[PDB]
Structure formats: structure tokens, C-alpha cells
Write a protein that binds this DNA or RNA. Structure first.
Ligand SMILES: Nc1nc2c(ncn2[C@H]2C[C@H](O)[C@@H](COP(=O)(O)OP(=O)(O)OP(=O)(O)O)O2)c(=O)[nH]1
Ligand SMILES: [Ca+2]
Ligand SMILES: [Ca+2]
Length: 341
DNA sequence: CGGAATCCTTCCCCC
DNA sequence: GGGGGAAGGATTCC
């Protein structure tokens, strides 16, 4: 069992560089402008020249401009990066039929039925980086190990423009060595629950009654962690498919006025519908981010698919429900369609 | 900002 | 008691 994970590098900013090489060498910040005030928004990603000063995905655009007033600030163009990504996925399909496209910039490849050992996995590594570099001008990091989790961990160590193998004898040392927060699927909230249990390394999950662990972090995440620490995790590479599609926009002002919120909501539906392209949902959820940034949703499943006119009027009922059931002003409003026929 | 998956918890109907 | 859903939220990741 040999897994090869590819993670493109600083992907949105790099696509922006490829499309305008005069940017190379500069710090580049791809931005999501919310539109409220000048430079309201967040940073979607930054290249390494900007990242080394603390500019990174998550921080407000206004914060990045204090740090790096003279960086280049580009608005996010998802559709472009999506096409460039689709193209790259096609290159990887030629190295395995068993391919799992995990996100816009990450894929796993099952190269058992191609390569015989780590030495050859590695070479396939350079072949692939070099192909993508030649054909699309994009640098990627490659991680290789015996399962998907360690393949990813590998790339994270090796990025950017890296390649790295984590072999069976190293898996074993990491299970002891590796900080459990650095395991994929463990965010701040789970890492904290684990400290309180005394777990700071994968291996520690063996010192705990399964039922205490299960009760603290859920059964699913408990099994996941235990199987990992037992050198036994072994999920297969599977083609996955969109289960939902939606759009949330930010309003100019916060509001509780139905007539004020409706147009943003309609525009969210319009765009969601465009994005569905020949796919029909039986579920609709209306999603609202309140002023103190909590997220309240209200949904409805139909026994048939949902036409646009239906989605329009049903979404208004769901928005009225939210307003009736939650006292705060609304900041961001949108829709999500799911359960495709 | 934004997009999305997966999971957990509660509730519900009902054999 | 437990199968079988749906709803709404928690949490995660890019
Ligand atoms: N709008 C938005 N987009 C994000 C965010 N995080 C990641 N992305 C998008 C843009 C990124 O270029 C792309 C890839 O995610 P990554 O976590 O792998 O970041 P990055 O491209 O910098 O990877 P890298 O560290 O260079 O290997 O997905 C985010 O918080 N907001
Ligand atoms: Ca990336
Ligand atoms: Ca981490």
C-alpha cells in the first residue's frame, strides 16, 4: 500500500504569478473584498514573499496592508484557478486511475499498481512535479507514505516545492514524536479537548479507555485517532463528488429588514443556480451569519427537486423563520443546495 | 471572506 | 429498544 499526495503551492497567488510573471519575486496577496468599507475582506492566500512577514489566509486585508503596504493585492478569481486546477488533475490521472481529488489543490494517488517501492515512488514524484512544472508552470509539493494521512503530513513537512517520503519505520517514530494537533482532522477545539485528557501525541490515545475518548471527541474521531496510532489506518483512495453547492454574500449594512436582505439572498440563489448546471437539488438551506459572527441556518427537504421559482419563495420563508427565531442583526446571508437527484 | 464535508446531538415517527 | 430519517449546529479544511 503506497500513497502519493500532491499539494500545489500557494495556489491562488501562484496562478496569479503564472498569468503575470512580472509579479514573480514580489509579495502577492490574493484577496476576498467583502465590499463594506475600502479593503474590508480577508486574505485568501499569499505567496511566500508575503507570507514570511505574517501575511496569510484568514487575516483581514486591512491588517495585511499595515504589514506590507506595498505588496500586490489581487482580488480572488476562483473560476480561473478552478480551470487551471482541473487541467492539472488531468495530468495526474495518467499516473493512476485510483485518484481522489480532495480540494482545489490537493489530490491523492494510489500508485501501488504502478510503482514497486519507495525508491520508485520518489522518482514518480519528480516525474510528476516536473510534468506539472513543464506543462502548467506550477510548483507542487509531493508527500509519500503508506496511507493518506501520512502522505499529507509528509507534504506539510516538505513544503514548498518539496518532495518527501515517510517510510514505515518513520511512521512509527512520528506516532510517538508528532504533536497530535498536527494530525489532519484535529483543529483547535479537538487539540484542547485532548490536552485535558493528557493526550499530546498520537500514541497517548492508547492510554485511554475508548469510551472516555469517544465521549469527549466523538466516536468517529476516536476510531480515526486510535487506528492511526496503531499503524492500522488504511482508508482507500476514492473519487468523491459534490454533495452540495451554495453561495454566501456579505451585505453593505447589517440588517433585520426583510426587504433589505432579500436582494442579496436572491443574488446568492441566482449564482448557486448557475453553479448547479444540470444538477437538481431536493434540499435548500438558508444560512445567516449574525452580527457577532454566529451562524444560524434553516432548511427544508422536498420530496421532489427544487425549481428556481420554488427556491426563491421557500428561501424567503426560511429567512423569515431565522428573523423570528433569532434576535440579532444579519451580517452575511446565503443559500446552500443539496441532495441532488 | 468564502466554500464545503462530515460528524454529532436532538428530535421525531413508529414497529 | 432501536431503525430511520431530518434538522440544526460543531468542527474542520482549504
Ligand atoms: N477564501 C479563502 N481561500 C482559502 C483559504 N485557505 C485556503 N484557501 C484557498 C486558496 C489557497 O491558495 C488554496 C489552497 O489552500 P492551502 O491551505 O493549501 O494554501 P496554500 O495555497 O498557500 O498552500 P501552501 O502552504 O503553499 O502549500 O485554497 C481561506 O481561508 N480563505
Ligand atoms: Ca496549495
Ligand atoms: Ca495544524
Amino acid at each position: 500500500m503506497i500513497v502519493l499526495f500532491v499539494d500545489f503551492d500557494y495556489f491562488y497567488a501562484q496562478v496569479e504569478e503564472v498569468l503575470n510573471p512580472s509579479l514573480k519575486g514580489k509579495p502577492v496577496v490574493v484577496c476576498v473584498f467583502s465590499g463594506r468599507f475600502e479593503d474590508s475582506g480577508a486574505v485568501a492566500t499569499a505567496n511566500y514573499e508575503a507570507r514570511k512577514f505574517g501575511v496569510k489566509a484568514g487575516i483581514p486585508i486591512v491588517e495585511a496592508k499595515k504589514i506590507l503596504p506595498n505588496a500586490v493585492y489581487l482580488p480572488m478569481r476562483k473560476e480561473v484557478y478552478q480551470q487551471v486546477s482541473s487541467r492539472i488533475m488531468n495530468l495526474l490521472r495518467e499516473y493512476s486511475e485510483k485518484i481522489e481529488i480532495a480540494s482545489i489543490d490537493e489530490a491523492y494517488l494510489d500508485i501501488s499498481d504502478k510503482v514497486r517501492d519507495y525508491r520508485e515512488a520518489y522518482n514518480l514524484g519528480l516525474e510528476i512535479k516536473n510534468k506539472i512544472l513543464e506543462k502548467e508552470k506550477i510548483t507542487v509539493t509531493v508527500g509519500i507514505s503508506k496511507n493518506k494521512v501520512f502522505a499529507k503530513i509528509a507534504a506539510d513537512m516538505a513544503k514548498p516545492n518539496g518532495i518527501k517520503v515517510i517510510d514505515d519505520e518513520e511512521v512509527k517514530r512520528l506516532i510517538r514524536e508528532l504533536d497530535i494537533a498536527d494530525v489532519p482532522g484535529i483543529g483547535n477545539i479537538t487539540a484542547e479537548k485532548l490536552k485535558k485528557l493528557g493526550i499530546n501525541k498520537l500514541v497517548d490515545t492508547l492510554s485511554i479507555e475508548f469510551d472516555k475518548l469517544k465521549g469527549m471527541i466523538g466516536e468517529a474521531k476516536a476510531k480515526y485517532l486510535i487506528s492511526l496510532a496503531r499503524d492500522e489506518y488504511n482508508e482507500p483512495i476514492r473519487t468523491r463528488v459534490r454533495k452540495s453547492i451554495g453561495r454566501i454574500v456579505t451585505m453593505k449594512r447589517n440588517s433585520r429588514n426583510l426587504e433589505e436582505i432579500k436582494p442579496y439572498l436572491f443574488r446568492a440563489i441566482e449564482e448557486s443556480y448557475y453553479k448547479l448546471d444540470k444538477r437538481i437539488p431536493k434540499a435548500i438551506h438558508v444560512v445567516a451569519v449574525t452580527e457577532d459572527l454566529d451562524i444560524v441556518s434553516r432548511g427544508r427537504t422536498f420530496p421532489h427537486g427544487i425549481s428556481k421559482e420554488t427556491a426563491y419563495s421557500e428561501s424567503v420563508k426560511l429567512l423569515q423563520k431565522i428573523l423570528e427565531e433569532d434576535e440579532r442583526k444579519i451580517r452575511r446571508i446565503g443559500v446552500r443546495f443539496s441532495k441532488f437527484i
